[PDB]
Amino acid sequence: DERRELEKVAVKAIMAAMLGNTDEVREQLQRALEIARESGTLLAVVLALEVVARVAIEAARKGNTDAVREALEVALEIARESGTKVAVVLALEVVARVAIEAARRGNVLAVILALEVALEIARESGTEEAALLAVEVVVRVSDEAKKQGNAVAVAVAEQVAKKILEES
Amino acid sequence: DERRELEKVAVKAIMAAMLGNTDEVREQLQRALEIARESGTLLAVVLALEVVARVAIEAARKGNTDAVREALEVALEIARESGTKVAVVLALEVVARVAIEAARRGNVLAVILALEVALEIARESGTEEAALLAVEVVVRVSDEAKKQGNAVAVAVAEQVAKKILEES
Amino acid sequence: DERRELEKVAVKAIMAAMLGNTDEVREQLQRALEIARESGTLLAVVLALEVVARVAIEAARKGNTDAVREALEVALEIARESGTKVAVVLALEVVARVAIEAARRGNVLAVILALEVALEIARESGTEEAALLAVEVVVRVSDEAKKQGNAVAVAVAEQVAKKILEES
Amino acid sequence: DERRELEKVAVKAIMAAMLGNTDEVREQLQRALEIARESGTLLAVVLALEVVARVAIEAARKGNTDAVREALEVALEIARESGTKVAVVLALEVVARVAIEAARRGNVLAVILALEVALEIARESGTEEAALLAVEVVVRVSDEAKKQGNAVAVAVAEQVAKKILEES
Amino acid sequence: DERRELEKVAVKAIMAAMLGNTDEVREQLQRALEIARESGTLLAVVLALEVVARVAIEAARKGNTDAVREALEVALEIARESGTKVAVVLALEVVARVAIEAARRGNVLAVILALEVALEIARESGTEEAALLAVEVVVRVSDEAKKQGNAVAVAVAEQVAKKILEES
Amino acid sequence: DERRELEKVAVKAIMAAMLGNTDEVREQLQRALEIARESGTLLAVVLALEVVARVAIEAARKGNTDAVREALEVALEIARESGTKVAVVLALEVVARVAIEAARRGNVLAVILALEVALEIARESGTEEAALLAVEVVVRVSDEAKKQGNAVAVAVAEQVAKKILEES
Amino acid sequence: DERRELEKVAVKAIMAAMLGNTDEVREQLQRALEIARESGTLLAVVLALEVVARVAIEAARKGNTDAVREALEVALEIARESGTKVAVVLALEVVARVAIEAARRGNVLAVILALEVALEIARESGTEEAALLAVEVVVRVSDEAKKQGNAVAVAVAEQVAKKILEES
Amino acid sequence: DERRELEKVAVKAIMAAMLGNTDEVREQLQRALEIARESGTLLAVVLALEVVARVAIEAARKGNTDAVREALEVALEIARESGTKVAVVLALEVVARVAIEAARRGNVLAVILALEVALEIARESGTEEAALLAVEVVVRVSDEAKKQGNAVAVAVAEQVAKKILEES
Amino acid sequence: DERRELEKVAVKAIMAAMLGNTDEVREQLQRALEIARESGTLLAVVLALEVVARVAIEAARKGNTDAVREALEVALEIARESGTKVAVVLALEVVARVAIEAARRGNVLAVILALEVALEIARESGTEEAALLAVEVVVRVSDEAKKQGNAVAVAVAEQVAKKILEES
């Protein structure tokens, strides 16, 4: 049922991200979080994070900075609440996919937001592995930004790399 | 005749797995199970499990999560109904082949489904050997996932290894 | 000599496909068929099918629906008359190449025509392998159409897949 | 709040640039600078530079030479005060966008003003990269001016290129 | 030196094409031909054909039918005298560029003249490739003429296509 | 120090290639040559050839035929003066990279210049291996030119291949 | 000396195979044959067959069907003229290496040509061993073609296997 | 404790090698050296050399020439200070692994740097065995470079082989 | 001292065989011969033949046909000059070891060269025992070649067996 419920949520949230309906994106992502919460399985976490990813990618394509921010905050919270390394790794992969799409589209706000959430996951996780993976996310985004000629995103990635390297 | 019958079933089920026709995959796999049931030989069990494997591998290549799930449930049932250790070992090898193909293709759902069936075979078998073989399946899938850079599958394999090690 | 003769035919037919000269495309493709007929070798069949492919690809690029249709009918007839599995497989590869080029160009008529000939080759061949290969052609065309954002072609491929799956 | 504050500033400054209200454009741009100053974040710098860009682009469309000058001086000061390479790069992109719009509109004063600020950013930055980027700005403006038949702007770009090449 | 000599010729011929000075265009193009003749290199042929192209394009923009005709006759002669396939291909590209500019400008005489020279290059070359390339020139000119709503040029291109297809 | 010196030279030469400053490109490339000369190491040769490559690639992107010519003459001289096979191979790779970039950009002059230097390296080297590598350069440039639809470059590559094959 | 002579021949023939120079490939391979003829040793036969192999492999990589055909005809003639089983076995190994490279490259003509020469060696040799080895060549080529997904080559290998099995 | 200390060093140094932070890579590698120094065991030497290897491999993958150089200098110093043949052999294996990774990645600087350190280990060791092993390193790198088509690295390996063979 | 001298020679010759340095292999093997000559003992002959064997084995592993040939010629000369049956038997064992290693490595040239030297030792020795031992060498090489699937070497061994059997 959760899959079908998450399907409803995904549909509504994606359409809201396409239209600039921040209120509806916020409400639907909160429901994805609650479904993951209520289900108590990694499979539900995975599905919810996939919904969050799809919403954020659509938002990144549209210049919908609010929806990217809302979605990645919910990925961060799913990573906080799940209590597993797998959820943290999956959240970082969501952040990477969103940031890469943003870099391709000239969406500098979404690159900034995504990389800040990568930094926050590394800061809160307190594992060496999460720091390493966050640096790998930053490198992937830098590579894409160089390829696309997105100088703002190259600079943002360098800034976040420096911050992780100084503060981790 | 069974071979030719299983040949028909294989053809139809593989084509259904390629097209996302969950209803037809389900029906055809049920018929493979029934043929193994009616034949009453290990050779028929072997052939049916090979059909199941081929269907699940094709599904794993295509992102057809439903068909992978349906196929591996039928492998599990063939392992339950056959009453031989050989059938259990063959079912575990099917699960390994499917999970390895899934790991190569980035099919994280199919890796999860396959490893869960490995865990269920170990849980239901109540033999030390089945636990050992299931752990060997998990290791093979982990190795492949590391080789392919499929971090989701590495994490899933670690999770299932931990579960078998805690609960077996 | 046949190669040089097929060279003449190719030149004239391609130029006719570029110009919307249906009458000349028809006449030249009939001569390619007759050369394959007169030669009585697989090498001549291969060469004639390559000529047919080149003509149909050029037609697909130009929106020349008549020439795509004429060319693929001649591929079908070469597959009917040759009496070999190799000719049938080569004809299906011609159909795939044409349909893929059409999908890339927004040529929905040519996608429809090509996939209908794939279906007819599967229907007339009466082999399991031809059905499997035709389904593989449909999948390749679907993949390309998704990649290019050609929703008409995605839908056409789904329709033909369904038909093969129901009627084969 | 800053975003909303910068929103107010943007609204007032753009309307002032449309009306030839130099005094109000000056006052509002000073407030954008002060908001960036008070906030102490790169995100605030980015937002303030976007406001400056929008004001200068509107001014360039209207023949409002004073407002283009005022706006680009504030971009220069934001680049001076921020203490980051990212702010310098963003300021140069503002200058490029304004100069390109000016070239399209026959606004030779705004092209001159913009390219002079590019030159000043390169002169003050003391980095090779800023010189390279400034030359890239000049090239982009030259390209646009050639495309639009704006011979004054082509000549101005050549003059500034020569100056950077002699003096850098 | 030839480059500088061809530079002088280009300057004088372009200015003559702008002013309707048929006598001077004729004399200067004859000198470009003679320079290519005297130099005995492909590089000189390339440069002379570029001069011819620039003169003919300027003429096509101005309604200077005489100068387009004179220039394309000299391209034809350079293609005749050079003894290389490369010169023939370059001459056909000159003809295409001139015909495309003419189609954009409503210069129906220049389209006719250019396409007739394409036809003559195909007729005199006696290679299949030159016929194919000439047909490609006609298609490019047809495409441009359709885009610009130049019905005379669409009709002329169709006429020349038909002639090449009947007589080649 | 040489690296930093070559860094200065690179910066100045690239900027000169972007601006059409033939005199400065010439002077800076002469200094790269002299640095390689003074250093007396293969590492210095490698670095100087990399500078030459970067300058020529930038020139090829800009239509700066003079700078491509100047740069490749200096690569040729570095290959002449170094006295090693490694320097000759590196010079040929520079020529290939420049010619490939030129083919992608429609820069037919730069393709011609580059392939002529490949031919001169093969002519002067008097080794079979240099002839083979030069032919491989021509093939790579032909492949790229076919891919990009740069018929002038395809023809030029064929001409140079023929010359090497006749005269080597 | 022969080695050095065969070295010259190899160099010229390989370069000709890379360039589509059928006339030169033909002439050089005839000279390899004549050197083997004049030398009267198995070592010279071995060296000549190695030259032939290298030429045919390069041709197979390039789509040079003429050169593959010419080269394998010369291997066949060396097998005919040498009067030893060793020469026949070496010729069959040449054919296998060429056909395998062709299968890897999608060069269906070269697979066909190579397998036809395997068939002709088996037909002319009149030994059981040559038939067995030819069938082993066909199997090796089939295996490679299956591995690479070269369905044309799989079908061609099956056809030739059938022919050897029916007619040997 | 040393293992955990070397773990910290490894983490920081690898992340620094990924980011182009030469200063931090230098500092961390100096600490690995000092830990090996302070510990006074072969096990500590082995662990430190493994850290150095991991850092240099990551650097070689990233184009971080400075970090490869710094790391291999520290391997050389560990080989100098340890006073055992085992440390020298382990240092040479580090150099080989780094050079092989560099050859695979097109990192010609890192191949050069690595092979120069192999040469220096052979020069300083004054044992026949170290010369033999260094030649084996060069051969392994040559083999890999040939396999990957890295002609620069093949040439560099040949140069270093020649130098060892002349000067050892 | 001779042992140490032969040690130097071995080191230099092996390294030369690894690098393709035919001139140095030739010179060093000549010195091994001269040491055996100067020493006048069977122990020196044994040591020199062991050096020759090691050099030839290394060459056979590397595809260094020249060095295998040079080394086995020196074994032949040591067998000619020593004046003892023991030296002849030891030379034949060297030839066998080299040919066996070559058979394992696919080094058909080295198998041919080695077996030809076995034949020459049998031809020059004029003893029945040397013929018998040479036939035993050929059998050992045939056995190894069959085991490794080296059909060229099997055929070469059969040829040499036939020659010894006809001509001995």
Side-chain angles (χ1 to χ4, degrees):
Chain A
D1 293 342
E2 293 83 334
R3 177 66 182 86
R4 290 178 180 174
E5 182 64 21
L6 293 174
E7 183 64 23
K8 292 293 187 182
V9 171
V11 171
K12 296 284 185 179
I14 291 162
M15 284 192 287
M18 287 192 276
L19 297 171
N21 188 318
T22 299
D23 288 343
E24 188 66 24
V25 171
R26 183 177 65 252
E27 181 67 21
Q28 293 297 336
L29 291 173
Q30 185 64 51
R31 290 177 63 85
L33 179 61
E34 291 297 323
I35 292 168
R37 289 178 180 173
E38 292 178 353
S39 294
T41 63
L42 177 61
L43 291 168
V45 171
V46 173
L47 291 172
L49 292 173
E50 291 296 323
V51 171
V52 171
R54 179 67 182 272
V55 172
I57 293 169
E58 291 294 352
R61 290 178 180 174
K62 299 299 182 187
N64 186 328
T65 299
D66 288 343
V68 171
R69 183 177 66 252
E70 181 67 21
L72 292 174
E73 290 177 354
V74 173
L76 180 61
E77 291 297 297
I78 292 168
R80 290 178 180 173
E81 294 179 354
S82 66
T84 66
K85 290 175 68 178
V86 176
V88 171
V89 173
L90 286 163
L92 286 169
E93 175 64 17
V94 171
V95 171
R97 289 178 180 173
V98 172
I100 293 168
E101 181 67 21
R104 290 178 180 173
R105 298 291 181 184
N107 186 328
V108 165
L109 289 168
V111 171
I112 292 168
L113 289 170
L115 292 174
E116 291 177 353
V117 173
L119 180 61
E120 291 297 351
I121 292 168
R123 182 180 63 80
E124 293 179 354
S125 180
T127 61
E128 293 83 4
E129 290 175 346
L132 287 167
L133 291 173
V135 170
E136 174 66 20
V137 171
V138 172
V139 170
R140 289 178 180 173
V141 173
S142 180
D143 288 344
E144 182 66 21
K146 289 179 181 178
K147 289 179 180 178
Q148 298 299 335
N150 185 328
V152 183
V154 171
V156 170
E158 178 184 9
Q159 289 291 310
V160 173
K162 286 180 175 179
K163 289 179 181 178
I164 294 168
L165 290 176
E166 292 178 354
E167 296 179 354
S168 175
Chain B
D1 293 342
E2 292 83 334
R3 178 66 182 86
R4 290 178 180 174
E5 182 64 21
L6 293 174
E7 183 64 23
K8 292 293 187 182
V9 171
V11 171
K12 296 284 185 179
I14 291 162
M15 284 192 287
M18 287 192 277
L19 297 171
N21 188 318
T22 299
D23 288 343
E24 188 66 24
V25 171
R26 183 177 65 252
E27 181 67 21
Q28 293 297 336
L29 291 173
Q30 185 64 51
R31 290 177 63 85
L33 179 61
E34 291 297 323
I35 292 168
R37 289 178 180 173
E38 292 178 353
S39 294
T41 63
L42 177 61
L43 291 168
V45 171
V46 173
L47 291 172
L49 292 173
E50 291 296 323
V51 171
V52 171
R54 179 67 182 272
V55 172
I57 293 169
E58 291 294 352
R61 290 178 180 174
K62 299 299 182 187
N64 186 328
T65 299
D66 288 343
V68 171
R69 183 177 66 252
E70 181 67 21
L72 292 174
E73 290 177 354
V74 173
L76 180 61
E77 291 297 297
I78 292 168
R80 290 178 180 173
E81 294 179 354
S82 66
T84 66
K85 290 175 68 178
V86 176
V88 171
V89 173
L90 286 163
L92 286 169
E93 175 64 17
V94 171
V95 171
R97 289 178 180 173
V98 172
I100 293 168
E101 181 67 21
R104 290 178 180 173
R105 298 291 181 184
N107 186 328
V108 165
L109 289 168
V111 171
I112 292 168
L113 289 170
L115 292 174
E116 291 177 353
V117 173
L119 180 61
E120 291 297 352
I121 292 168
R123 182 180 63 80
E124 293 179 354
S125 180
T127 61
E128 293 83 4
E129 290 175 346
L132 287 167
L133 291 173
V135 170
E136 174 66 20
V137 171
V138 172
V139 170
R140 289 178 180 173
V141 173
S142 180
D143 288 343
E144 182 66 21
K146 289 179 181 178
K147 289 179 180 178
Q148 298 298 335
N150 185 328
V152 183
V154 171
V156 170
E158 178 184 9
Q159 289 291 310
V160 173
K162 286 180 175 179
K163 289 179 181 178
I164 294 168
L165 290 176
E166 292 178 354
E167 296 179 354
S168 175
Chain C
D1 293 342
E2 292 83 334
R3 178 66 182 86
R4 290 178 180 174
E5 182 64 21
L6 293 174
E7 183 64 23
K8 292 293 187 182
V9 171
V11 171
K12 296 284 185 179
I14 291 162
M15 284 192 287
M18 287 192 277
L19 297 171
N21 188 318
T22 299
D23 288 343
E24 188 66 24
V25 171
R26 183 177 66 252
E27 181 67 21
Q28 293 297 336
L29 291 173
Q30 185 65 51
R31 290 177 63 85
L33 179 61
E34 291 296 323
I35 292 168
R37 289 178 180 173
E38 292 178 353
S39 294
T41 63
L42 177 61
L43 291 168
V45 171
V46 173
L47 291 172
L49 292 173
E50 291 296 323
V51 171
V52 171
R54 179 67 182 272
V55 172
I57 293 169
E58 291 294 352
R61 290 178 180 173
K62 299 299 182 187
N64 186 328
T65 299
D66 288 343
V68 171
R69 183 177 66 252
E70 181 67 21
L72 292 174
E73 290 177 354
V74 173
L76 180 61
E77 291 297 297
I78 292 168
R80 290 178 180 173
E81 294 179 354
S82 66
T84 66
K85 290 175 68 178
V86 176
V88 171
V89 173
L90 286 163
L92 286 169
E93 175 64 17
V94 171
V95 171
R97 289 178 180 173
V98 172
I100 293 168
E101 182 66 21
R104 290 178 180 173
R105 298 291 181 184
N107 186 328
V108 165
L109 289 168
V111 171
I112 292 168
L113 289 170
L115 292 174
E116 291 177 353
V117 173
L119 180 61
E120 291 297 352
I121 292 168
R123 182 180 63 80
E124 293 179 354
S125 180
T127 61
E128 293 83 4
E129 290 175 346
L132 287 167
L133 291 173
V135 170
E136 174 66 20
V137 171
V138 172
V139 170
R140 289 178 180 173
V141 173
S142 180
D143 288 344
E144 182 66 21
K146 289 179 181 178
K147 289 179 180 178
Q148 298 298 335
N150 185 328
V152 183
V154 171
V156 170
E158 178 184 9
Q159 289 291 310
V160 173
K162 286 180 175 179
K163 289 179 181 178
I164 294 168
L165 290 176
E166 292 178 353
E167 296 179 354
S168 175
Chain D
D1 293 342
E2 292 83 334
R3 177 66 182 86
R4 290 178 180 174
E5 182 64 21
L6 293 174
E7 183 64 23
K8 292 293 187 182
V9 171
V11 171
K12 296 284 185 179
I14 291 162
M15 284 192 287
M18 287 192 277
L19 297 171
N21 188 318
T22 299
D23 288 343
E24 188 66 24
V25 171
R26 183 177 66 252
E27 181 67 21
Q28 292 297 336
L29 291 173
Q30 185 64 51
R31 290 177 63 85
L33 179 61
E34 291 297 323
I35 292 168
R37 289 178 180 173
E38 292 178 353
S39 294
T41 63
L42 177 61
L43 291 168
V45 171
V46 173
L47 291 172
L49 292 173
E50 291 296 323
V51 171
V52 171
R54 179 67 182 272
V55 172
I57 293 169
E58 291 294 352
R61 290 178 180 173
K62 299 299 182 187
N64 186 328
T65 299
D66 288 343
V68 171
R69 183 177 66 252
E70 181 67 21
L72 292 174
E73 290 177 353
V74 173
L76 180 61
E77 291 297 297
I78 292 168
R80 290 178 180 173
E81 294 179 354
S82 66
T84 66
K85 290 175 68 178
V86 176
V88 171
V89 173
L90 286 163
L92 286 169
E93 175 64 17
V94 171
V95 171
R97 289 178 180 173
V98 172
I100 293 168
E101 182 67 21
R104 290 178 180 173
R105 298 291 181 184
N107 186 328
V108 165
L109 289 168
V111 171
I112 292 168
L113 289 170
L115 292 174
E116 291 177 353
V117 173
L119 180 61
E120 291 297 351
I121 292 168
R123 182 180 63 80
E124 293 179 354
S125 180
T127 61
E128 293 83 4
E129 290 175 346
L132 287 167
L133 291 173
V135 170
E136 174 66 20
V137 171
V138 172
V139 170
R140 289 178 180 173
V141 173
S142 180
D143 288 343
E144 182 66 21
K146 289 179 181 178
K147 289 179 180 178
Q148 298 299 335
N150 185 328
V152 183
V154 171
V156 170
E158 178 184 9
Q159 289 291 310
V160 173
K162 286 180 175 179
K163 289 179 181 178
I164 294 168
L165 290 176
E166 292 178 354
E167 296 179 354
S168 175
Chain E
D1 293 342
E2 293 83 334
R3 178 66 182 86
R4 290 178 180 174
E5 182 64 21
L6 293 174
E7 183 64 23
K8 292 293 187 182
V9 171
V11 171
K12 296 284 185 179
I14 291 162
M15 284 192 287
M18 287 192 277
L19 297 171
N21 188 318
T22 299
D23 288 343
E24 188 66 24
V25 171
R26 183 177 65 252
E27 181 67 21
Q28 292 297 336
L29 291 173
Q30 185 65 51
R31 290 177 63 85
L33 179 61
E34 291 297 323
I35 292 168
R37 289 178 180 173
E38 292 178 353
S39 294
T41 63
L42 177 61
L43 291 168
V45 171
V46 173
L47 291 172
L49 292 173
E50 291 296 323
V51 171
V52 171
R54 179 67 182 272
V55 172
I57 293 169
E58 290 294 352
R61 290 178 180 174
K62 299 299 182 187
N64 186 328
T65 299
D66 288 343
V68 171
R69 183 177 66 252
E70 181 67 21
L72 292 174
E73 290 177 354
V74 173
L76 180 61
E77 291 297 297
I78 292 168
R80 290 178 180 173
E81 294 179 354
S82 66
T84 66
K85 290 175 68 178
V86 176
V88 171
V89 173
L90 286 163
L92 286 169
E93 175 64 17
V94 171
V95 171
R97 289 178 180 173
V98 172
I100 293 168
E101 181 67 21
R104 290 178 180 174
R105 298 291 181 184
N107 186 328
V108 164
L109 289 168
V111 171
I112 292 167
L113 289 170
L115 292 174
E116 291 177 353
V117 173
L119 180 61
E120 291 297 351
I121 292 168
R123 182 180 63 80
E124 293 179 354
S125 180
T127 61
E128 293 83 4
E129 290 175 346
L132 287 167
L133 291 173
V135 170
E136 174 66 20
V137 171
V138 172
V139 170
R140 289 178 180 173
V141 173
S142 180
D143 288 344
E144 182 66 21
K146 289 179 181 178
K147 289 179 181 178
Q148 298 298 335
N150 185 328
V152 183
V154 171
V156 171
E158 178 184 9
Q159 289 291 310
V160 173
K162 286 180 175 179
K163 289 179 181 178
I164 294 168
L165 290 176
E166 292 178 354
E167 296 179 354
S168 175
Chain F
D1 293 342
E2 292 83 334
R3 178 66 182 86
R4 290 178 180 174
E5 182 64 21
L6 293 174
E7 183 64 23
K8 292 293 187 182
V9 171
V11 171
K12 296 284 185 179
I14 291 162
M15 284 192 287
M18 287 192 277
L19 297 171
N21 188 318
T22 299
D23 288 343
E24 188 66 24
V25 171
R26 183 177 65 252
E27 181 67 21
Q28 293 297 336
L29 291 173
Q30 185 65 51
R31 290 177 63 85
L33 179 61
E34 291 297 323
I35 292 168
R37 289 178 180 173
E38 291 178 353
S39 294
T41 63
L42 177 61
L43 291 168
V45 171
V46 173
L47 291 172
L49 292 173
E50 291 296 323
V51 171
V52 171
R54 179 67 182 272
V55 172
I57 293 169
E58 291 294 352
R61 290 178 180 174
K62 299 299 182 187
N64 186 328
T65 299
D66 288 343
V68 171
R69 183 177 66 252
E70 181 67 21
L72 292 174
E73 290 177 354
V74 173
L76 180 61
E77 291 297 297
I78 292 168
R80 290 178 180 173
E81 294 179 354
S82 66
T84 66
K85 290 175 68 178
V86 176
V88 171
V89 173
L90 286 163
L92 286 169
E93 175 64 17
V94 171
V95 171
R97 289 178 180 173
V98 172
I100 293 168
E101 182 67 21
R104 290 178 180 173
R105 298 291 181 184
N107 186 328
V108 164
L109 289 168
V111 171
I112 292 167
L113 289 170
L115 292 174
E116 291 177 353
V117 173
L119 180 61
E120 291 297 352
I121 292 168
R123 182 180 63 80
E124 293 179 354
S125 180
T127 61
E128 293 83 4
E129 290 175 346
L132 287 167
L133 291 173
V135 170
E136 174 66 20
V137 171
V138 172
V139 170
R140 289 178 180 173
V141 173
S142 180
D143 288 343
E144 182 66 21
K146 289 179 181 178
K147 289 179 180 178
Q148 298 299 335
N150 185 328
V152 183
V154 171
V156 171
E158 178 184 9
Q159 289 291 310
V160 173
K162 286 180 175 179
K163 289 179 181 178
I164 294 168
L165 290 176
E166 292 178 354
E167 296 179 354
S168 175
Chain G
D1 293 342
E2 292 83 334
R3 178 66 182 86
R4 290 178 180 174
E5 182 64 21
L6 293 174
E7 183 64 23
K8 292 293 187 182
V9 171
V11 171
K12 296 284 185 179
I14 291 162
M15 284 192 287
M18 287 192 277
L19 297 171
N21 188 318
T22 299
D23 288 343
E24 188 66 24
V25 171
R26 183 177 66 252
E27 181 67 21
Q28 293 297 336
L29 291 173
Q30 185 65 51
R31 290 177 63 85
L33 179 61
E34 291 296 323
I35 292 168
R37 289 178 180 173
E38 292 178 353
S39 294
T41 63
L42 177 61
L43 291 168
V45 171
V46 173
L47 291 172
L49 292 173
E50 291 296 323
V51 171
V52 171
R54 179 67 182 272
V55 172
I57 293 169
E58 290 294 352
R61 290 178 180 174
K62 299 299 182 187
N64 186 328
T65 299
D66 288 343
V68 171
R69 183 177 66 252
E70 181 67 21
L72 292 174
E73 290 177 354
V74 173
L76 180 61
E77 291 297 297
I78 292 168
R80 290 178 180 173
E81 294 179 354
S82 66
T84 66
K85 290 175 68 178
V86 176
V88 171
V89 173
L90 286 163
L92 286 169
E93 175 63 17
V94 171
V95 171
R97 289 178 180 173
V98 172
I100 293 168
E101 182 67 21
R104 290 178 180 173
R105 298 291 181 184
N107 186 328
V108 164
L109 289 168
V111 172
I112 292 168
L113 289 170
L115 292 174
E116 291 177 353
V117 173
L119 180 61
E120 291 297 352
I121 292 168
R123 182 180 63 80
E124 293 179 354
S125 180
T127 61
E128 293 83 4
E129 290 175 346
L132 287 167
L133 291 173
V135 170
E136 174 66 20
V137 171
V138 172
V139 170
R140 289 178 180 173
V141 173
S142 180
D143 288 344
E144 182 66 21
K146 289 179 181 178
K147 289 179 180 178
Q148 298 298 335
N150 185 328
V152 183
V154 171
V156 170
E158 178 184 9
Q159 289 291 310
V160 173
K162 286 180 175 179
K163 290 179 181 178
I164 294 168
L165 290 176
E166 292 178 353
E167 296 179 354
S168 175
Chain H
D1 293 342
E2 293 83 334
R3 178 66 182 86
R4 290 178 180 174
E5 182 64 21
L6 293 174
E7 183 64 23
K8 292 293 187 182
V9 171
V11 171
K12 296 284 185 179
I14 291 162
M15 284 192 287
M18 287 192 277
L19 297 171
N21 188 318
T22 299
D23 288 343
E24 188 66 24
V25 171
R26 183 177 65 252
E27 181 67 21
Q28 293 297 336
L29 291 173
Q30 185 65 51
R31 290 177 63 85
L33 179 61
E34 291 297 323
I35 292 168
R37 289 178 180 173
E38 292 178 353
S39 294
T41 63
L42 177 61
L43 291 168
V45 171
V46 173
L47 291 172
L49 292 173
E50 291 296 323
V51 171
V52 171
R54 179 67 182 272
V55 172
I57 293 169
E58 291 294 352
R61 290 178 180 174
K62 299 299 182 187
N64 186 328
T65 299
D66 288 343
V68 171
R69 183 177 66 252
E70 181 67 21
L72 292 174
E73 290 177 354
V74 173
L76 180 61
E77 291 297 297
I78 292 168
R80 290 178 180 173
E81 294 179 354
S82 66
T84 66
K85 290 175 68 178
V86 176
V88 171
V89 173
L90 286 163
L92 286 169
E93 175 64 17
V94 171
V95 171
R97 289 178 180 173
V98 172
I100 293 168
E101 182 67 21
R104 290 178 180 173
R105 298 291 181 184
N107 186 328
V108 164
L109 289 168
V111 171
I112 292 168
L113 289 170
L115 292 174
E116 291 177 353
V117 173
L119 180 61
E120 291 297 352
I121 292 168
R123 182 180 63 80
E124 293 179 354
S125 180
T127 61
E128 293 83 4
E129 290 175 346
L132 287 167
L133 291 173
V135 170
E136 174 66 20
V137 171
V138 172
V139 170
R140 289 178 180 173
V141 173
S142 180
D143 288 343
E144 182 66 21
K146 289 179 181 178
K147 289 179 180 178
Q148 298 298 335
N150 185 328
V152 183
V154 171
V156 171
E158 178 184 9
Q159 289 291 310
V160 173
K162 286 180 175 179
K163 289 179 181 178
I164 294 168
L165 290 176
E166 292 178 354
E167 296 179 354
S168 175
Chain I
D1 293 342
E2 292 83 334
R3 178 66 182 86
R4 290 178 180 174
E5 182 64 21
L6 293 174
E7 183 64 23
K8 292 293 187 182
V9 171
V11 171
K12 296 284 185 179
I14 291 162
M15 284 192 287
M18 287 192 277
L19 297 171
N21 188 318
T22 299
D23 288 343
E24 188 66 24
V25 171
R26 183 177 65 252
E27 181 67 21
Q28 293 297 336
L29 291 173
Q30 185 65 51
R31 290 177 63 85
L33 179 61
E34 291 297 323
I35 292 168
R37 289 178 180 173
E38 292 178 353
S39 294
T41 63
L42 177 61
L43 291 168
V45 171
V46 173
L47 291 172
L49 292 173
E50 291 296 323
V51 171
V52 171
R54 179 67 182 272
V55 172
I57 293 169
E58 290 294 352
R61 290 178 180 174
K62 299 299 182 187
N64 186 328
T65 299
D66 288 343
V68 171
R69 183 177 66 252
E70 181 67 21
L72 292 174
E73 290 177 354
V74 173
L76 180 61
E77 291 297 297
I78 292 168
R80 290 178 180 173
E81 294 179 354
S82 66
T84 66
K85 290 175 68 178
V86 176
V88 171
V89 173
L90 286 163
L92 286 169
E93 175 63 17
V94 171
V95 171
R97 289 178 180 173
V98 172
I100 293 168
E101 182 67 21
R104 290 178 180 174
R105 298 291 181 184
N107 186 328
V108 165
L109 289 168
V111 171
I112 292 168
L113 289 170
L115 292 174
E116 291 177 353
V117 173
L119 180 61
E120 291 297 352
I121 292 168
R123 182 180 63 80
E124 293 179 354
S125 180
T127 61
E128 293 83 3
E129 290 175 346
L132 287 167
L133 291 173
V135 170
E136 174 66 20
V137 171
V138 172
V139 170
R140 289 178 180 173
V141 173
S142 180
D143 288 344
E144 182 66 21
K146 289 179 181 178
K147 289 179 180 178
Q148 298 298 335
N150 185 328
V152 183
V154 171
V156 170
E158 178 184 9
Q159 289 291 310
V160 173
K162 286 180 175 179
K163 290 179 181 178
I164 294 168
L165 290 176
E166 292 178 354
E167 296 179 354
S168 175

